[PDB]
């Protein structure tokens, strides 16, 4: 993806005006520095490889972390899958109106020992389960529930101390692209919710300890990482200026255009 | 000369005498839906002389203390002729547009407008916990207008209309990434934009989804000296291009 | 049992690797593709589109549309200065938040030329001539029009064509520069001066405005992707 190189230039005295244009046409001028001054011939070997949409987006970013405790009934986690709870991946995905990618999904699970009162605790390695429930399936209501059989719902099991688990997910959508913005309602009467929450139906993700609580409580935390592969992107969008406020909508409190200096001629 | 155009669509004609070029979309022209792209099975309606014609909206007044205006695009033409009657009887529909904003003043006036057409422009609410109601987001062929100040949070369901954030939380100078054009009163008189159909689905319901927004924002304010004409209007005419509809039922 | 031997780097999670992993939904049939207008393949197609730059940050203009208008009047002296700012596209607060300077804050290095377009939003009966200069570093900022004509300048005559382009060139000792503020890779200054006056007739307002745009040329390039310092978070968005 090599960039264009500059050609040599000579003094001119003519009726050709490359420097004079009209910006009211909505057209960006294609002038080069060899049209306004005398240049030499350089040949550039610089590439535009690190600014592709694949290289910009295909990096792992944390999207959530949730906790759950061993020594508790209904100590298990749940998360309704979205990408609008962190600030850094939300701003990168919202430079485009529509996107279409596959996923790669990594989990980082850790644990901590909680203040028990029994003498000489000694635990084995912990095993965790992460079950994915598509919209419409049965949900678990406690740790020893029937819904963790996983007859058709996909799940992973993982023992502590190994490499982190990792799956791959195709483009799972009803439309032809994912939408980051949606200017509309759910109802035909134009009441109720408004915005991108109408198009978000991706499922829930559950987490538990498979082991039973032996002698001390254990509090675990799982972090979820997203990595887009095979990316396509349409209709670029200006980058967000104000800080994000909520998850479901695009509300803001107004901020200045940039920071200020003391003069128009100060450097 | 490169300063004159003539656009003819149906039984309507637009002539202009000083103008910039015409901007077409993201490079593509509107066209009907193909067969390897479609998903609905019944046959579409293509009336195409009764709906693809220029409809003129109401006029707004450019004052000196004026901040901007906006229109939500398949909603302004929801009571316009046989285009708004086909939207009521059908469930689906897809449509490209051609927009002609026109504003004339003398050689003794000055000012500059940005005419931008932005897709999927979700607006923000004044109260940070709600979403804005429908009557604040759009009117039928009447302009909703920006403000030079900030709407208070005590208002429950309104649109945040601080003009330097453009209602969407961005920089208003960065809105030149969408298909846009300027009206400089020194050089220009009118701006013409041709937009294709942009969505993530091949057809959509035109009553619960506004997929285009037309904003007109004065960057350089209007000015004149005493004796010149104070009343300067702005007029917008929009014509659908290559419109088709599926799913005929009762009138809604 | 083929004999193998595991090397360092086993069972680690490096967040910028490139491997294959088993699918969780086997034989899934995806939605067919669609021709959507406006496909972007490279981020250097966004930076080549020009956006308006707020030269007028004067602490009561940043929360208004007055930040973008450069005031231009009819004087009684000659050789005055219109504006001036250093050419730091990712550290100076004038060019920091534009469409080019927002892409640059995701990267560490940059190189190439930079376009600066100026539009004269005055009356059609007003005239004027300006001097748009760029001076490489080593000396200070030019304090006169005489010091600014020794650099790379253009002389702009307003008329039917209302816009002019000042193209700053790539004059550097290194191949790349830093986006962050570095004195070792300083890039110089951009100033503007009155060549002649703004002469208006009677019953015409003598105070005009100028809009400024900034884009990138076809030899622009970026390197070493990082995280932007603009967005921030304390708790989860809920």
């Amino acid at each position, epitope marked *: 993806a090599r960039v264009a190189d500059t050609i040599s230039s000579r003094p001119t005295n003519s009726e050709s005006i490359p420097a004079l244009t009209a910006a009211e046409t909505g057209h960006t001028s294609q002038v080069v520095p060899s049209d306004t001054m005398q240049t030499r011939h350089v040949k550039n070997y610089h590439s535009r490889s690190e600014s592709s949409i694949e290289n910009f987006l295909c990096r792992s970013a944390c999207v959530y972390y949730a906790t759950y405790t061993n020594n508790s009934k209904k100590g298990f986690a749940e998360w309704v899958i979205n990408t609008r709870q962190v600030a850094q991946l939300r701003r990168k995905l919202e430079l485009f109106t529509y996107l279409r990618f596959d996923l790669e999904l990594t989990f980082v699970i850790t644990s901590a020992q*909680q*203040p028990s009162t029994a003498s000489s605790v000694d635990a084995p390695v912990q095993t965790h389960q992460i079950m994915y429930v598509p919209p419409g399936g049965p949900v678990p209501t406690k740790v020893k529930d029937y819904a963790w059989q996983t007859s058709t719902n996909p799940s992973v099991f993982w023992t502590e101390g190994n490499a982190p688990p990792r799956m791959s997910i195709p483009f799972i959508s009803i439309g032809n692209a994912y939408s980051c913005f949606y200017d509309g309602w759910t109802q035909f009467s134009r009441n109720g919710v408004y915005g991108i929450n109408t198009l978000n139906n991706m499922g829930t993700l559950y987490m538990r300890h498979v082991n039973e609580a032996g002698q001390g409580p254990i*509090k675990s935390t799982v972090r979820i990482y997203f990595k887009p592969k095979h990316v396509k992107a349409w209709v670029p969008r200006p980058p967000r200026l104000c*800080q*994000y*406020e*909520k998850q479901k909508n695009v509300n803001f*409190s*107004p*901020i*200045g255009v940039t*920071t*200020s200096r003391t003069d128009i001629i100060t450097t | 000369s490169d300063r004159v155009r003539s656009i003819t669509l149906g039984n309507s004609t637009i002539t202009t005498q000083e103008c910039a070029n015409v901007v077409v979309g993201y490079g593509v022209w509107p066209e009907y839906l193909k067969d390897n792209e479609a998903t609905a099975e019944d046959q579409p309606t293509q009336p195409d002389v009764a709906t693809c014609r220029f409809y003129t909206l109401e006029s707004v007044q450019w004052m000196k203390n004026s901040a901007g205006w906006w229109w939500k695009l398949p909603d302004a033409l929801s009571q316009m002729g046989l285009f708004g009657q086909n939207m009521q009887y059908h469930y689906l529909g897809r449509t490209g547009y051609t927009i002609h904003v026109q504003c004339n003043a003398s050689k003794f006036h000055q000012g500059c407008l940005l005419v931008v057409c932005v897709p999927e422009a979700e607006m923000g609410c004044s*109260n*940070l*916990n709600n979403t804005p109601e429908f009557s604040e987001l759009s009117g039928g062929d009447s302009a909703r207008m920006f403000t030079d*100040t*900030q709407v*208070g*949070e*005590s208002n*429950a369901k309104k649109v945040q209309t601080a003009v330097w954030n453009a209602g969407m939380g961005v920089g208003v100078g960065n809105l030149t990434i969408f298909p846009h054009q300027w009206i400089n009163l020194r050089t220009n008189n009118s701006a013409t934009l041709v937009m294709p159909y942009i969505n993530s689905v091949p057809m959509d319901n035109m009553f619960r989804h506004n997929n285009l927004t037309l904003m007109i924002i004065p960057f350089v304010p209007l000015n004149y000296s005493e004796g010149s004409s104070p009343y300067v209007p702005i007029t917008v005419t929009i014509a659908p291009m290559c419109a088709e509809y599926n799913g005929l039922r009762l009138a809604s | 049992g083929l004999p193998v031997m595991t090397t360092p780097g086993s069972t680690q999670f490096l967040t910028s690797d490139d491997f294959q992993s088993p699918s969780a939904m086997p034989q899934f049939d995806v939605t067919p593709e669609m021709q959507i207008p406006g496909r972007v393949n490279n981020l250097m197609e966004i930076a080549e589109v020009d956006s308006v730059v707020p030269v007028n940050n004067t*602490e009561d203009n*940043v*929360s208004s549309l007055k930040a973008y208008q450069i005031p231009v009047q009819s004087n009684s002296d000659n050789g005055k200065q219109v504006f001036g700012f250093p050419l730091q596209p990712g550290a100076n607060n004038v060019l920091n938040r534009t469409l080019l300077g927002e892409i640059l804050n995701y990267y560490t290095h940059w190189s190439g030329s930079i376009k600066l377009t100026f539009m004269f939003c005055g009356s059609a009966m007003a005239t004027g001539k300006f001097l748009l200069a760029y001076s490489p570093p080593g000396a200070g900022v030019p304090k006169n029009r005489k010091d600014a004509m020794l650099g790379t300048h253009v002389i702009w005559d307003v008329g039917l064509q209302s816009s002019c382009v000042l193209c700053v060139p790539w004059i550097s000792q290194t191949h790349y520069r830093y986006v962050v503020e570095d004195e070792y890779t300083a890039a110089g200054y951009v100033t503007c001066w009155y060549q002649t006056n703004i002469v208006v007739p009677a019953d015409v307002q003598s105070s005009c405005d100028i809009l400024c745009f900034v884009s990138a040329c076809n030899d622009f390039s970026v390197r070493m992707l990082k995280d932007t310092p603009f967005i*921030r*978070q*304390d*708790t*989860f*968005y*809920q």
Partner: antibody, heavy 117, light 106 residues
Framework: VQLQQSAAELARPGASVKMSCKASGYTFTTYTMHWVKQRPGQGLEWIGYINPSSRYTEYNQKFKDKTTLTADKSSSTAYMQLSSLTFEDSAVYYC???????????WGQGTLVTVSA | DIQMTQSSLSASLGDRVTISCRASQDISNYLNWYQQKPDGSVKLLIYYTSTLHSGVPSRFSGSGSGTDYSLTINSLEQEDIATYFCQQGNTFPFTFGGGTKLEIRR
């Protein structure tokens, strides 16, 4: 990041007083700054805020005519002026910085304002 | 204005303490819990119905739905002897609850 308020004050009934909240460790014009009042026999009570980027203030409907909030972008300071001081205005006043939606993560230490003669 | 009704609870060290407050209408899981130390410093504990802020120990726990909410400390220590307010973020303006001060039993 911390917010540092001024020292305790004292005033006559009918006079005016001015507090302070010097913020450091972050960019001052990015977040709004809110003011909370706590009387010693009551709970906490919200007064108003100010947008430091545009100097836009919005008050509660009870403190609308007595309180005046102001700020400066130079010294990273936010002021609050109480006017027509009565004996109900003897409390502890906190400055807090609002975050994601309705959460105040960073608080000041409070100033004791007491009226007497 | 949403009335946020919460006065002084007593418990021994190392026991389970439960502080509750009740809204006037539905606030839709938008509740926050704060802690005011006896020297006068305030800090955020739980920034949703159940989500702990970073730097808060795992003794604290939040629950509730609709109108009735609660805050639980599972093992009382000497550092948790403070005043606890609850705050809603559903309607303009922000309303806080009254305090609830913890003290030693005997």
């Amino acid at each position: 990041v911390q917010l540092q308020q001024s020292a305790a004050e004292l005033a006559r009934p009918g006079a005016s007083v001015k507090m302070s909240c010097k913020a450091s460790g972050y960019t001052f014009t990015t977040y709004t700054m809110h003011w909370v009042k706590q009387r010693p026999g009551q709970g906490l009570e919200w007064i108003g805020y100010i947008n430091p980027s545009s100097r836009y203030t919005e008050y509660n409907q009870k403190f609308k005519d007595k309180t005046t909030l102001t700020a400066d972008k130079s010294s990273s300071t936010a002021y609050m002026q109480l006017s027509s001081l009565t004996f109900e205005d003897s409390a502890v006043y906190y400055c807090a910085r609002r975050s994601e939606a309705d959460r105040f993560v960073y608080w000041g230490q409070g100033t004791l304002v007491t009226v007497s003669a | 204005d949403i009335q946020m009704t919460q006065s002084s609870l007593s418990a021994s060290l190392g026991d389970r303490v439960t502080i509750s407050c009740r809204a006037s209408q539905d606030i839709s899981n938008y509740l926050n819990w704060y802690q005011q130390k006896p020297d006068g410093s305030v800090k955020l504990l739980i920034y949703y119905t159940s989500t702990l802020h970073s730097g808060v120990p795992s003794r604290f726990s939040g629950s509730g739905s609709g109108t009735d909410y609660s805050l639980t400390i599972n093992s009382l220590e000497q550092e948790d002897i403070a005043t606890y307010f609850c705050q809603q973020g559903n309607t303009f303006p922000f309303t806080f609850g009254g305090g609830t001060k913890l003290e030693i039993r005997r």
